Structures are given as structure tokens and as C-alpha cells.
Amino acid sequence: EAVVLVVLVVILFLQTWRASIIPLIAVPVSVVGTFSILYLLGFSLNTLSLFGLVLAIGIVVDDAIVVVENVERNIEEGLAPLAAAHQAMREVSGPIIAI
Amino acid sequence: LLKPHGAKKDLPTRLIDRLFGWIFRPFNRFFLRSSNGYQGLVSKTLGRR
Amino acid sequence: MDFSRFFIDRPIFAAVLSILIFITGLIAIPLLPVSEYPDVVPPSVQVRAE
Amino acid sequence: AMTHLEELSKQILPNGMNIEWTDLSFQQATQGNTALIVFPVAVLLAFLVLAALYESWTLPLAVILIVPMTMLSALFGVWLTGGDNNVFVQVGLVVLMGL
Amino acid sequence: ACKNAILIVEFARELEIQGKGIMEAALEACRLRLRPIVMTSIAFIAGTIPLILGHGAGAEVRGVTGITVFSGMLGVTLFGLFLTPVFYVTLRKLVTRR
Numbered sequence: 001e002a003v004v005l006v007v008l009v010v011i012l013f014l015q016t017w018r019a020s021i022i023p024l025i026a027v028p029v030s031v032v033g034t035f036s037i038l039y040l041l042g043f044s045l046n047t048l049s050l051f052g053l054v055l056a057i058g059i060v061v062d063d064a065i066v067v068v069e070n071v072e073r074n075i076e077e078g079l080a081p082l083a084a085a086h087q088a089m090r091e092v093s094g095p096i097i098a099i
Numbered sequence: 100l101l102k103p104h105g106a107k108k109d110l111p112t113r114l115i116d117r118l119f120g121w122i123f124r125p126f127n128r129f130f131l132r133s134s135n136g137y138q139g140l141v142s143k144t145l146g147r148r
Numbered sequence: 149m150d151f152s153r154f155f156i157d158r159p160i161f162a163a164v165l166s167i168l169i170f171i172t173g174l175i176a177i178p179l180l181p182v183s184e185y186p187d188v189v190p191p192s193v194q195v196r197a198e
Numbered sequence: 199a200m201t202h203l204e205e206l207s208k209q210i211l212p213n214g215m216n217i218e219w220t221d222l223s224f225q226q227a228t229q230g231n232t233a234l235i236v237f238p239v240a241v242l243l244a245f246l247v248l249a250a251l252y253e254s255w256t257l258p259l260a261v262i263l264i265v266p267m268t269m270l271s272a273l274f275g276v277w278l279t280g281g282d283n284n285v286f287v288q289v290g291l292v293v294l295m296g297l
Numbered sequence: 298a299c300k301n302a303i304l305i306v307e308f309a310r311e312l313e314i315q316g317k318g319i320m321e322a323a324l325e326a327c328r329l330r331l332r333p334i335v336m337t338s339i340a341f342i343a344g345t346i347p348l349i350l351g352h353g354a355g356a357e358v359r360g361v362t363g364i365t366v367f368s369g370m371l372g373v374t375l376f377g378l379f380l381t382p383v384f385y386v387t388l389r390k391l392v393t394r395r
């Protein structure tokens with residue numbers, strides 16, 4: 001459901017299906033990737049860790065929206081996609097680390 | 100994946116523009132008005148700190 | 149600063165890193181213990197006599 | 199041999215008797231073949247490293263498709279000399295595929 | 298709330314570095330962050346509807362969570378878009394008075 005909603009929100013606002021691919025992929029990678037560190041740290045799949053995982057989808061979705069909206073804004077301002085990507089990550093990549 | 104701003108439409112975009120394009124322009128009109136409203140609102144807020 | 153520069157310009161490195169993360173999460177899923185709750189009941193020992 | 203002996207025992211033993219494997223046979227009977235997961239994981243990880251090295255989803259196949267021939271050369275030597283594919287031979291195959 | 302507000306503040310800071318005044322930078326930062334903040338808020342909020350409107354297995358934890366997230370997200374959005382730039386300007390003017 002989160003993946004369907006974010007896809008539709010991205011299409012509604014940015015009006016290109018290409019922008020919806022970024023969360024489409026990034027969200028499941030980020031959620032499924034979480035299990036390898038949970039495994040290494042000795043955790044179990046239980047109703048509480050699984051609940052945290054679903055709440056975390058919110059943070060993961062916001063991350064993907066931040067990146068793709070900021071690239072697309074720079075494209076709306078006339079930059080080619082490659083320059084728009086570099087400019088967009090000069091704007092948010094350091095902040096993402098800090099966040 | 101993202102195309103330059105006014106690129107020719109590919110097949111899925113044209114399909115979405117067909118299927119759903121009637122949503123985009125009223126939403127676009129509503130976002131622009133809401134955006135301008137927020138701008139005035141926060142601007143008056145900053146004068147009332 | 150553009151901490152993403154290298155990946156933006158060489159997207160297959162980004163793909164490979166994400167697939168590796170994904171793959172290792174998939175491997176880990178069936179290795180995880182599974183229960184309703186974490187272990188929170190204090191351990192106890194019963195002595196029975198008759 | 200184990201399947202045959204299981205079959206034999208169904209044919210031979212009276213109701214109320216059965217066989218149980220013990221020692222190394224019990225381990226053989228209760229172990230899964232994780233090779234079915236290990237081998238595809240190994241190939242896929244090696245493919246991914248090479249995809250990054252060559253910046254190509256297809257050039258890794260020029261390497262990967264070659265390794266079955268080294269394994270066949272070695273196993274042909276075993277066949278010709280009357281050997282078997284014991285665990286020492288098997289590690290040798292993998293090192294030769296590595297080289 | 299923190300994720301959204303850190304970027305409002307970062308953008309305003311950048312806009313001052315690139316010449317703009319304290320107030321102009323705060324306002325332009327909010328203008329730039331408005332769309333992604335609202336996209337996330339809409340996505341989150343819509344996702345709470347099946348938690349609010351779903352009875353059966355797990356319904357009790359689903360319910361308390363949706364109410365918490367729905368209400369919290371309205372506040373995330375509104376206080377992030379209106380309180381943050383006020384604090385930004387106040388603290389900037391506090392350390393650049395004369």
C-alpha cells in the first residue's frame with residue numbers, strides 16, 4: 001500500500017511516471033535490507049520489530065520523495081536531468097547524512 | 100530516468116495523460132492557488148512573531 | 149557538496165550496492181528467529197516433589 | 199543406498215518395527231541441501247562485482263560462461279584416471295574455476 | 298518533523314549564503330520545501346485510512362497507530378510550515394542584531 005500511495009502522490013504532483021520509479025525501488029530495497037543488520041545484531045522477527053519496520057516505511061518514503069522531488073524541481077527550472085541530479089544532491093546530500 | 104522538462108511524451112505518459120489528464124489541470128490550479136495562499140499566510144505570520 | 153557525484157555518474161555502481169543490500173536482507177529473512185514478542189518473561193526454574 | 203534401505207524396510211519389517219538412521223547417515227537424512235541457495239548466491243555476487251567493474255550488465259558473462267569448461271577439464275582428468283569427486287577434488291575444482 | 302525542518306533551515310541558510318536577507322531566505326526556503334512536505338504528508342495520511350477503517354485481526358494496534366499518525370502528521374505539516382521559519386528568523390535576528 002505504501003508503494004502504491006507514494007507512486008500515485010508522485011504522479012499527481014510531479015506528473016511523470018518516471019519519477020515514481022525512484023520510490024518504487026528505493027522503498028523495498030530499504031525495508032528488505034533492514035533484515036540483514038537485524039540478523040547480525042541478534043534480533044528476531046516479532047510483532048514489535050515488525051511494527052517498527054512498518055512505521056519506518058514513513059521515513060523511507062519521505063527520503064525517496066525528498067530526492068526525486070528535488071531533482072525534478074531542478075528539471076522544472078530548465079536543467080538537464082544529469083545536471084539537475086548533481087545540483088539537487090549538492091542541495092540535500094550532506095543534509096541527508098546529517099538527518 | 101527523468102526526461103528534460105518539455106520532452107516528447109512517451110507511450111505510458113500519453114496513456115496516463117489520456118486516462119487521467121483531466122485530474123492534472125484542476126489539481127495544478129488548486130496547488131498554485133494553495134501555494135500562493137500559503138506564501139501570503141507565512142509572510143504575515145513572520146510579521147507577527 | 150555532492151556526496152552522490154560518483155553514483156550519479158556511474159549508476160551501475162549504485163544499482164550493484166542496492167542489489168547487494170537487498171540480497172543480503174533476503175538471505176537473512178529465513179535465518180531470523182520468529183516469535184510474538186521478544187524474550188521478556190523472567191527465567192524461572194520449577195522444583196516438583198510429591 | 200539410504201532410499202533403497204528405506205524401501206526394503208517397508209517391504210520387510212512387520213507392523214510395529216521400523217528403521218532409524220544413526221551416526222553419519224542420520225546427518226545425511228536430516229540435513230537440507232543449502233547448496234541450492236549457496237551456489238546461485240555465489241554466482242550472483244560474482245556477477246554483480248563484475249558488472250560494477252565493467253560498468254556492463256552483459257560483459258560479466260564473458261567470464262562467467264568460461265568457468266564450466268575448466269571444471270570439465272579437471273573432471274575429465276578424474277574420469278580418465280578412475281578417480282571420484284571427493285571433497286578434496288571438489289575444492290580443487292572451485293580453486294581452478296577461481297584461477 | 299525533524300527531517301522536514303532541518304531542510305527548511307538548511308535551504309534558508311544556503312539562500313543567505315547566496316545573498317538573500319534573513320526574512321527573504323526563510324520565505325523562499327518555505328516556498329521550496331512546501332511541495333515535498335505536502336507530498337509526504339498526503340502519502341502518510343492516506344496510508345492511515347486502512348488502519349483507522351480496518352477491523353479484524355490486529356485491529357486494535359492498527360487503530361491506535363493510525364489515530365496517532367494521522368493527528369501527528371497534521372501537526373508535522375502545519376507546525377513545520379509555519380513555526381520553523383518564525384524560529385529561523387527570530388534566532389537569526391538574535392545573533393545579527395546590530
Ligand SMILES: CCCCCCCCCCCCO[C@@H]1O[C@H](CO)[C@@H](O[C@H]2O[C@H](CO)[C@@H](O)[C@H](O)[C@H]2O)[C@H](O)[C@H]1O
Pocket residue numbers: 039040041042043179180181
Ligand atoms: C572482503 C572480505 C569478505 C567479507 C566476508 C563477509 C563475511 C560475512 C560472514 C557473516 C557470517 C556471520 O555468521 C553468523 O553470525 C551470526 C551473528 O554473529 C551468528 O548469530 C546469529 O545466529 C545465532 C544463533 O545461531 C543468534 O545469536 C542470532 O539469531 C544471530 O546473531 C550466527 O550463528 C553465524 O552463522
Ligand SMILES: CCCCCCCCCCCCO[C@@H]1O[C@H](CO)[C@@H](O[C@H]2O[C@H](CO)[C@@H](O)[C@H](O)[C@H]2O)[C@H](O)[C@H]1O
Pocket residue numbers: 090093094095097098149150314
Ligand atoms: C553522532 C555524531 C555526529 C557528529 C558529526 C555530525 C556531522 C554532520 C555532517 C554532515 C554535513 C555534511 O553536509 C555539508 O554541510 C555543510 C555545512 O556543514 C554544507 O556547507 C554549506 O555551508 C557552509 C558553511 O557552513 C559553506 O561553507 C558552503 O558554501 C555550503 O555548502 C554542505 O553543503 C553540506 O554538504
Ligand SMILES: CCCCCCCCCCCCO[C@@H]1O[C@H](CO)[C@@H](O[C@H]2O[C@H](CO)[C@@H](O)[C@H](O)[C@H]2O)[C@H](O)[C@H]1O
Pocket residue numbers: 025029157158159160161163166167170252253254255
Ligand atoms: C532490487 C534493486 C534493483 C535496483 C535496480 C536498479 C537498476 C538500475 C540500472 C542502472 C543503470 C546503470 O547500469 C549501467 O550503468 C552504466 C554506467 O554505470 C551504463 O554504462 C554506460 O556508461 C559507462 C560509463 O559510466 C560506460 O563505460 C558504458 O560503456 C556505458 O554503457 C550502462 O549502460 C547501464 O546499463
Ligand SMILES: CCCCCCCCCCCCO[C@@H]1O[C@H](CO)[C@@H](O[C@H]2O[C@H](CO)[C@@H](O)[C@H](O)[C@H]2O)[C@H](O)[C@H]1O
Pocket residue numbers: 028032177178182
Ligand atoms: C515482495 C516482498 C515483500 C517485502 C518483504 C517484507 C518481508 C517481511 C517479512 C517476511 C518474513 C517471512 O517470514 C516467514 O513467514 C513465513 C510465512 O508465514 C514462514 O514460512 C512458512 O510458511 C508456510 C506455512 O506457514 C510453509 O509452507 C513454509 O515452508 C514455512 O516456512 C517463515 O518461516 C517465516 O520466516
Ligand SMILES: CCCCCCCCCCCCO[C@@H]1O[C@H](CO)[C@@H](O[C@H]2O[C@H](CO)[C@@H](O)[C@H](O)[C@H]2O)[C@H](O)[C@H]1O
Pocket residue numbers: 037041042043044181185186187
Ligand atoms: C545501522 C544502525 C544500527 C543502529 C543499531 C544500534 C544497536 C544498539 C544496540 C542494541 C543492542 C543489541 O543487543 C541485542 O539485543 C537483542 C534483543 O533482541 C538480544 O537478543 C537476545 O534475545 C532475543 C529475544 O528478544 C533472542 O532472539 C536471542 O536469544 C538473543 O539474541 C541480543 O542478545 C543482544 O545482543
Ligand SMILES: CCCCCCCCCCCCO[C@@H]1O[C@H](CO)[C@@H](O[C@H]2O[C@H](CO)[C@@H](O)[C@H](O)[C@H]2O)[C@H](O)[C@H]1O
Pocket residue numbers: 001002005046047048050051054055057058061184340341342343344345348354355356358359362363366
Ligand atoms: C504511507 C506511509 C505510512 C507510514 C505509516 C504506516 C504505519 C503502519 C501502521 C502500523 C501497522 C500495524 O500492523 C499491525 O501490527 C501489529 C503489531 O505488529 C499486528 O498485531 C499482531 O500482533 C499483536 C501482538 O503485538 C497481537 O495482539 C495481534 O492480535 C496481531 O494481529 C497486526 O496484525 C498488524 O496489522
